[PDB]
Each structure stands twice: as structure tokens, then as C-alpha cells.
Design a protein around this ligand. Structure first.
Ligand SMILES: CC(C)N1CCN(C(=O)c2cccs2)CC1
Ligand SMILES: [Zn+2]
Ligand SMILES: [Zn+2]
Length: 582
């Protein structure tokens, strides 16, 4: 408690000495409350006019139009201390998992230089506005780095002054850039050096890409075993226990010198003790604390989520195989059994899973996994939308399994080669492309974001008739040489001015380890679609009058957008499709 957070608390109290008040009508039960002070402020979602003008039939589909309009009772919940047997299973598994992840990797500090280049090419390192305008500016001013230095020497003493969270099934905890640097310095290696790559972690998919995920699920399906299980957790970040945060901190056991102490301080002072400021309309800024739950940068959150999910799913697999009998208490011979299971089959059991942060697919040895619920419930990883003790409903066909908001189709090319393609409800794809984030967008920037969506569709969703047509229309309506843009940056091969057929060939043929025959595709007409009925099942408008008029008259929509943008160099991409090729 207050010895570790007090300094952070004391500092904030004094910047607002003409405001501090210990409110007695504060809503917090599970968060420790400290005080309040005076503020007054709030960013909603704008429509992309380039995409909307070129998707007119969807103007009357509520699933699309409703996406552009507009539970904090979950962050104010408490997770119970796991039983002693559960805690022993987690500590043993965590120790073993960090060793396996560390066998072919070296922990190392990330640098000012690496951090500087990141901010100058835009990731989403959730920072704040205020002393400097953007992150871009703060990074060149050596004053900033003196601020960073002061804090860094404080962390080496085992104390913290400025590492405070700012709140805003989505609650996002922004920190000041300096605190984000110190997090990146100590823990950025997990992401930067690909600790959760499939090659290194066996369960992970970090850096894999939406064109690989389907092939990976199909490889899991080839394993002997039962159904494929894909149970979502109800609010994963809110169910991270102090026991989880301590098993995550054991990565420091693999570190040395300065790095080890710097990483130790992030875990001790910012993760296992937290200070947060929250808006409240009744507008006072509330200063609250708690030890548990997930609040890190979104990128470190991804890696530690993947780690703890890998651990939880190996333990659920142990329970199904009867490796331990009760969570209440692990016997001595049960520890040697768990240890020997990990040594003997640990890597094989990791290869049975695909895990992306809080999202998982598991193909266990058999269906006893379905009713192996005691450790999973006791770790606080309670399944979403099923009763606590009801057995999991698994999937018999890898093509129906949900993963990373997608399902995957097996699609045979006219030449016999096999594509495993990503897919989701087409209303969701069109509805997202029609939305832009933030304000001050020029017409050119709006057009370049439309082009980014269009190129993603050509590359990932070419097999959907409506998206290949709309992608070609958007790429025809935006000047040929204008560069696709985005304000936050799965591998993004569509972010390029290269010809999309050349990128398709590189991604689906040349670089595709599941494709033996490397014969390049010479035209878009070689590249197949889903069956017509499968396309409709996944949300296609083919066979509607609205869609037929849209397709037939597409050049008129293209010309509307070209007239708005003005006299620029445009390419006609519609003759890449059979029906427009005269
Ligand atoms: C059974 C149902 C899915 N329909 C089959 C016939 N049909 C077409 O042939 C096409 C029209 C426009 C492009 S393809 C529309 C869809
Ligand atoms: Zn700090
Ligand atoms: Zn589909």
C-alpha cells in the first residue's frame, strides 16, 4: 500500500492544492480511493465519405449504418485468491514456460533510439498530449529525457513519482510518454524480439498475419485428439490476479544487471501497484489504486496476456488428462507428475494451441477437456456466455472455429492449389471501413485511408464478390500514386503503392510455406471466390436488385468521387474483373 504509491499520490495532491477533497460519496468498492480535484473535458467516430459513396447499397443495412453511431461495473469487480493447489500448478507451469520461451532468446533493453523511430512512424503507445504537443516533439527535446532520467534513477532506488494511469468491454489506460518509454526499455523485447512467434512459443501467432492464421488452425486440426475448443473469457484484463502478475514477473529471473532491476521496478511499482486518475461527472478527477488486474501498454499487455493464457490452457489440458486430482492441494508426487508431464509432453501440448493474447483455440488429447473446469474457474478465467459448470461446446470442423474475430475457408484454385483464407460477416468489414478516428482529416487523407481498406480487402478478402468489386472501385476513385495511410498500425502487406497483384503473388504463393508449387498468378481472374451460396451465408448482397444496380453502374460512382477529389491521375481497375473486361 501507501509507501509504494504515496509519493505518486503526494505529488498529484500538490499540483492541485487549491482543489484536493476526500469525497465521502465516492462510488469505489474494489478500488482504494485517495482524493479528488477540479477538471472539465470529454472523441467519437466520423464517417469516411470516400468508402460510403462507393458502398451505396449498404446505406440501408442497419448492421452497417448503426456501427458509425454513438461495462464500468466490470473494472469495479474483485477476483478471489486461488486455492493452494491452483497457485502451485501456476508457479510450476510459469517457471517452465519462461525457461522454454528463453531457450533461444536473450532478454535485452530496448533503446531511446528504437523508441524514437517508433514514435516517428506511429504505433499506438497510448501516451497523452500537457507540455509538448505530440509524442513526435517531446522525443527530440532533451528536457523530456532529463525527466525520464530522474524517474529511471528513482526506479533503481525502488521508488516511483510520475508513472500514473489515466482511464477512458474496452477501458484504455494512457500514461505519459516517459512512463511508456521506461515500460518499453524494460519489457519491449517481448514484442520487438518476437518471444510469442509460433517458431519460438509453439502456441503463439505473434507477427503471423491473417493470411497465415487459417493454415495454422488447419495444422492444429491434423493432430490426433478431440474437438477444437475456443472458449472466450469474460473480461480477461479484469480477471488477471496478483498471482498472475507475480508469475509474469518471473521473466526477470532470466535477466541481469541493470535490465533485471529496471524490469523488476516496472512489475513492482506500476503493475503490482497502480495509481489511476478517472473523470467523474458529479467533473472531479478521482485518484484510485489497486494491486491486481491488467494495466500496461497495449503491446506489453498482448505478450503477458498470451503468456498467462498459454499457462492457463496447459493447466486445463493437465486437468483433462488427470495429471492432478484436486486444486485444493497438490501432493508431493503430484508436483513430480506435473513437472514430468511438462518435461515429457509440454512442447507437444503447446503445439495443440493457437493463442493470441486472451483469444485461444485448443485441440486437446480428447474431450475430457470439455468438463475440466475447476482450475480454469479457480484461476478466475471464467468463460463468457455459458454457465460456470456447464461443459464447453467444441467444434468438429476447423473451418467453423472462431479465432481473432474470423473463421477460415478452404478454397481450391482452378489450378488445384489450396488457399486457406480469412473471413467474417461482410457487414462488419464494410461498417469498419466506413469509419475514421479523430478530426482534421483532409479529403486526400480520407481518400488514402479508404485506399488502405480497399488494398486490405484485395489481399485478405478477395474471395468475397462485393469486397473485390468495392476494392477495385475505391482504387479506381483514388489517385493511382496517393499512398495508403492509417493512424494506428497482424502484418500489413496492403500498406504499399506496389501493384496489388504483385503483393498477392508474394503473400499467397512466393512466401506461403503451405504452397509447394510457386507458379505466379498472371491475372485477378485466376484468383477464385467462395461458392455463391457461401458468399451469401457470410453476408454478400449478390442476388439483390440494390447490388445489381450498384455493380452495373459502378463507373458513375467512381466518377462522382473523382469529381470531388478533382483533376488527378486515376487508373481504371474494374477491367481486372470478367464482367467489366468488356
Ligand atoms: C442462391 C444464391 C446464393 N444466388 C445464386 C444466383 N446468384 C448469382 O448467380 C449471382 C448474381 C450476381 C453475382 S453471382 C446470386 C446468388
Ligand atoms: Zn515510475
Ligand atoms: Zn465466411
Amino acid at each position: 500500500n501507501l509507501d509504494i504509491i504515496g509519493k505518486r499520490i503526494e505529488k498529484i495532491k500538490q499540483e492541485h492544492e487549491t482543489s484536493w477533497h476526500y469525497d465521502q460519496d465516492h462510488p469505489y468498492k474494489t478500488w482504494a480511493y485517495h482524493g479528488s480535484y477540479e477538471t472539465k473535458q470529454t472523441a467519437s467516430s466520423m464517417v469516411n465519405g470516400v468508402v460510403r459513396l462507393l458502398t451505396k447499397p449498404w446505406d440501408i443495412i442497419p448492421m452497417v449504418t448503426q456501427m458509425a453511431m454513438t461495462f464500468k461495473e466490470k473494472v469495479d469487480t474483485r477476483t478471489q485468491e486461488p486455492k493452494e493447489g491452483t497457485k502451485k500448478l501456476m508457479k510450476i507451469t510459469a517457471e517452465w514456460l519462461w525457461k522454454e520461451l528463453g531457450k533461444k532468446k536473450t532478454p535485452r533493453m530496448c533503446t531511446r533510439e528504437e523508441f524514437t523511430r517508433k514514435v516517428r512512424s506511429n504505433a499506438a503507445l497510448g501516451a497523452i498530449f500537457n507540455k509538448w504537443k505530440s509524442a513526435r516533439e517531446a522525443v527530440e527535446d532533451s528536457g523530456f529525457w532529463e525527466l525520464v532520467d530522474k524517474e529511471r534513477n528513482l526506479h533503481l532506488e525502488g521508488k516511483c513519482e510520475t508513472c500514473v494511469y489515466n482511464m477512458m468491454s474496452r477501458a484504455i489506460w494512457y500514461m505519459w510518454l516517459g512512463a511508456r518509454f521506461l515500460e518499453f526499455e524494460a519489457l519491449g523485447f517481448l514484442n520487438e524480439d518476437h518471444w510469442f512467434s509460433r517458431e519460438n512459443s509453439l502456441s503463439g501467432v505473434e507477427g503471423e498475419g491473417l493470411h497465415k492464421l487459417g493454415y495454422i488452425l488447419r495444422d492444429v486440426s491434423k493432430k490426433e485428439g478431440g474437438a477444437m475448443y475456443a472458449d472466450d473469457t469474460a473480461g480477461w484484463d479484469t480477471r488477471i490476479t496478483l498471482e498472475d502478475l507475480k508469475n509474469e514477473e518471473m521473466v526477470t529471473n532470466h535477466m541481469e544487471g541493470e535490465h533485471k532491476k529496471l524490469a523488476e521496478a516496472i512489475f513492482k511499482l506500476t503493475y503490482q501497484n497502480k495509481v489511476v486518475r478517472v473523470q467523474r461527472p458529479t467533473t472531479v478527477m478521482d485518484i484510485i489504486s489497486r494491486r491486481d488486474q491488467r494495466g500496461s501498454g497495449q503491446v506489453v499487455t498482448y505478450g503477458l496476456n498470451t503468456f498467462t493464457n498459454m499457462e492457463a490452457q496447459l493447466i486445463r489440458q493437465m486437468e483433462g488428462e488427470g495429471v492432478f486430482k484436486s486444486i485444493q492441494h497438490l501432493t508431493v508426487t503430484e508436483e513430480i507428475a506435473v513437472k514430468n508431464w511438462l518435461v515429457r509432453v509440454g512442447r507437444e501440448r503447446l503445439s495443440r494451441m493457437a493463442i493470441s493474447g486472451d483469444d485461444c483455440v485448443v485441440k486437446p488429447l480428447d474431450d475430457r477437456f470439455a468438463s475440466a473446469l475447476t482450475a480454469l474457474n479457480d484461476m478466475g478465467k471464467v468463460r463468457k456466455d455459458i454457465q460456470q459448470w456447464e461443459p464447453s461446446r467444441g467444434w468438429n470442423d476447423w473451418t467453423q472455429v472462431p479465432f481473432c474475430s474470423h473463421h477460415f475457408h478452404e478454397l481450391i484454385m482452378k489450378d488445384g492449389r489450396v488457399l486457406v483464407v480469412p473471413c467474417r460477416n461482410q457487414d462488419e468489414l464494410i461498417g469498419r471501413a466506413r469509419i475514421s478516428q479523430g478530426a482534421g482529416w483532409s479529403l486526400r487523407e480520407t481518400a488514402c485511408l479508404g485506399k488502405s481498406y480497399a488494398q486490405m480487402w484485395s489481399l485478405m478478402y478477395f474471395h468475397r464478390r462485393d469486397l473485390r468489386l468495392a476494392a477495385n472501385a475505391i482504387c479506381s476513385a483514388v489517385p493511382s500514386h496517393w499512398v495508403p495511410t492509417s493512424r494506428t498500425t497482424a502484418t500489413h502487406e496492403w500498406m504499399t503503392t506496389e501493384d496489388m497483384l504483385t503483393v498477392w503473388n508474394r503473400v499467397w504463393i512466393q512466401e506461403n510455406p503451405w504452397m509447394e508449387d510457386k507458379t505466379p498468378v498472371e491475372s485477378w481472374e485466376e484468383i477464385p471466390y467462395l461458392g455463391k451460396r457461401e458468399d451469401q451465408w457470410c453476408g454478400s448482397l449478390i442476388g439483390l436488385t440494390s447490388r445489381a444496380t450498384w455493380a452495373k453502374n459502378i463507373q458513375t460512382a467512381i466518377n462522382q468521387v473523382r469529381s470531388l477529389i478533382g483533376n488527378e491521375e486515376y487508373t481504371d481497375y474494374m477491367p481486372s474483373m470478367k464482367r467489366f473486361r468488356r
